[PDB]
């Protein structure tokens, strides 16, 4: 009897408040900020999906995720995304 619908608003304001302490974000702009996240999530996951299936694989992996980020994001966009993720996977498997 509630009908709760999920969204990314809580983490786009953490990241925004951190990367712009004085700047807010309107509700309508956060809707765009949410749709953007869902769109890129769809794109990267779909490309990793196809990547795994091309090599006759039943599992989408972070290696396939990195290659899909190499395919999706343009040159710099890619480099930064790949570096950020790569460094986030060595900070996570080191039990920090």
């Amino acid at each position: 009897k509630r009908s709760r619908k999920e969204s990314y608003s809580v983490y786009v304001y953490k990241v925004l408040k951190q990367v712009h302490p004085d700047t807010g974000i309107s509700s309508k702009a956060m809707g765009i900020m949410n749709s953007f996240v869902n769109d890129i999530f769809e794109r990267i996951a779909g490309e990793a999906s196809r990547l795994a299936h091309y090599n006759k694989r039943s599992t989408i992996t972070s290696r396939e995720i990195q290659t899909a980020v190499r395919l999706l994001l343009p040159g710099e966009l890619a480099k930064h995304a790949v570096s950020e993720g790569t460094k986030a996977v060595t900070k996570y498997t080191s039990s920090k």
């Binding site: 090599n55 396939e64 290659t67």
Partner: peptide
């Protein structure tokens, strides 16, 4: 060449070009 490096292969096959 990105579809070829990922499959750990040294030759760009026609399937890579099609993909």
């Amino acid at each position: 060449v990105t579809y070829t490096e990922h499959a750990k292969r040294k030759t760009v096959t026609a399937m890579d070009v099609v993909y």
